[PDB]
From a paper:
Structurally, HDAC6 is a zinc-dependent metallohydrolase with an atypical complex domain organization that interacts predominantly with cytosolic substrates, including tubulin, cortactin, and peroxiredoxins. The catalytic activity of HDAC6 toward acetylated substrates has been studied both experimentally and computationally. Zinc-dependent histone deacetylases (HDACs) play critical roles in numerous (patho)physiological processes through the deacylation of lysine residues of their substrate proteins. Herein, we report on the synthesis and biochemical, crystallographic, and computational characterization of a series of oxadiazole-based inhibitors selectively targeting the HDAC6 isoform. Surprisingly, but in line with a very recent finding reported in the literature, a crystal structure of the HDAC6/inhibitor complex revealed that hydrolysis of the oxadiazole ring transforms the parent oxadiazole into an acylhydrazide through a sequence of two hydrolytic steps.
To elucidate the binding mode of inhibitor 8 in the HDAC6 active site, we co-crystallized 8 with the catalytic DD2 domain of the wild-type zebrafish orthologue (zHDAC6; amino acids 440–798). The crystal structure of the zHDAC6/inhibitor complex was solved by molecular replacement to the resolution limit of 1.35 Å. Surprisingly, the Fo–Fc electron density peaks in the vicinity of the active-site zinc ion revealed that the oxadiazole ring of the parent compound 8 had been hydrolyzed into a hydrazide reaction product (4, identified later). Once we had confirmed the chemical nature of the product by liquid chromatography–mass spectrometry (LC–MS)/MS, it was modeled into well-resolved Fo–Fc positive electron density peaks in the later stages of the refinement. The hydrazide group of 4 coordinates the active-site Zn2+ ion in a bidentate fashion, with an interatomic distance of 2.6 and 2.1 Å between the Zn2+ ion and the C=O and the terminal NH2 group of the hydrazide, respectively. Furthermore, the C=O group accepts a hydrogen bond from the hydroxyl group of Y745 (2.6 Å), and the N–N group forms hydrogen bonds with the imidazole ring present in the side chains of H573 (2.9 Å) and H574 (2.7 Å). The chlorophenyl moiety of the cap group of the inhibitor is positioned within van der Waals distances from the side chains of H463, F583, P464, and L712 (modeled in two conformations) of the L1-loop pocket. One of the more notable features here is the T-shaped π–π stacking interaction between the chlorophenyl group and the side chain of F583 at a distance of 5.1 Å between the aromatic ring centers. At the same time, the methylsulfonyl group is solvent exposed and does not contribute to interactions with the enzyme. The pyridine ring present in the linker engages in parallel π–π stacking with side chains of F583 and F643 lining the entrance tunnel, with distances of 4.0 and 4.2 Å between the respective aromatic residues.
Numbering used by the authors: 442 to 769, 774 to 798
Write the structure that this text describes.
């Protein structure tokens, strides 16, 4: 009945040498870690060590070409780092980037291992750079390797190929990389909530719309919950969980839950423009704890208001530790989004009928 926590200060070394105010800051993870100490959560957790992912583990989801290219950045001069980062959509690279990406992934593997071997019930991973925009063959959106997708495959690699893994992605952006990696896969249920604005919101693709339900044997196993029409918050996230996330998850019956836990839908976030509260994130966490016999790993993705992400992620950890949850009308367009997803998924999930 133990909660694991992984954090390693070495993941601060990845930085933007041309713009020190770029919002994907080293101090995102140190601020979150400090808040856990201040709230006396850290001493309640079992500390899981970080490690490097191996290149073989990266190949669970990424091409050997992509791995090779990111690894080559380790010894590049600034000019070539700039050139390489510019080949991608919204990437900056320093000499430390590759090692940090490997540590973020390795940290999550050790956390998944700790859960699946019964050393801990659940776990939190305070890691950067983030993962969910990274594709098999490319980096994107501050992400180099898809930490959460790699973690699902790593979990399968130590149990069975068909281990049922639910990934709930509540980062305010669509995890395009996670969707694509698992698009034909019925072993990994991908559920994302995200601001969409008919394609105006990053990463600017119709791949994030509610009608993208999965392909082939994966049909029904990709659930996109897209928001349009500006600010959303706790009422809309709670309704999406009540009507969609939780009934689908219960029918899937996952054996492991991974949360692509960006905190950029948080009140105060400059990039997300949403109003989800720390108490909101705590309730979402508590709901997910009802799945998979409590086997939940919370993985940091985005989230840029240092105070907001520190309070919100700490409240999720408080829930994992078994603390009592909070006791908390929708925007019109949110009702429209939820009903669109319900209609898209009723052919696949009896619970929605
Ligand atoms: C071009 S942009 O959209 O303004 N954008 C891309 C972006 C935004 C958010 C995320 C994210 O949080 N993903 N989870 C990833 N990439 C961006 C790029 C560089 C700097 C800033 Cl402030 C914003
Ligand atoms: K998301
Ligand atoms: K899938
Ligand atoms: Zn995000």
């Amino acid at each position: 009945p133990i909660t694991g926590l992984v954090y390693d200060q070495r993941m601060m070394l990845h930085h933007n040498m041309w713009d020190s105010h770029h919002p994907e800051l080293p101090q995102r993870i140190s601020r979150i870690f400090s808040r856990h100490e201040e709230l006396r959560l850290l001493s309640r957790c079992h500390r899981i060590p970080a490690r490097l992912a191996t290149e073989e583990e990266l190949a669970l989801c990424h091409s050997s070409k992509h791995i090779s290219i990111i690894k080559s950045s380790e010894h590049m001069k600034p000019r070539d780092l700039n050139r390489l980062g510019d080949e991608y959509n919204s990437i900056f690279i320093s000499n430390e980037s590759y090692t940090c990406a490997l540590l973020a992934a390795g940290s999550c593997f050790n956390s998944a291992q700790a859960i699946l071997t019964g050393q801990v019930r659940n776990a939190v991973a305070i890691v950067r750079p983030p993962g969910h925009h990274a594709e098999k063959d490319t980096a994107c959106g501050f992400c180099f390797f898809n930490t959460a997708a790699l973690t699902a495959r790593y979990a399968q690699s130590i149990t069975r190929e068909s281990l049922r893994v639910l990934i709930v992605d509540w980062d305010v952006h669509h995890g395009n990389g996670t969707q694509h990696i698992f698009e034909e896969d019925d072993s990994v249920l991908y559920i994302s909530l995200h601001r969409y604005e008919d394609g105006a919101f990053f990463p600017n693709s119709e791949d994030a719309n509610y009608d993208k339900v999965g392909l082939g044997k994966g049909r029904g196993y990709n659930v996109n919950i897209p928001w349009n029409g500006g600010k959303m918050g706790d009422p809309e996230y709670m309704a999406a969980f009540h009507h969609l996330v939780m009934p689908i998850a219960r029918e899937f019956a996952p054996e492991l839950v991974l949360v692509s836990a960006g905190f950029d839908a948080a009140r105060g976030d400059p990039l997300g423009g949403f109003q989800v509260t720390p108490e909101g994130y705590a309730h979402l966490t508590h709901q997910l704890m009802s799945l998979a016999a409590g086997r939940v790993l919370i993985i940091l993705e985005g989230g840029y208001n240092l105070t907001s992400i520190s309070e919100s992620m700490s409240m999720c950890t408080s829930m994992l530790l078994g603390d009592s949850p909070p006791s908390l009308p929708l925007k019109t367009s949110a009702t429209v989004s939820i009903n669109n997803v319900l209609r898209a998924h009723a052919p696949f999930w009896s619970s929605l009928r």
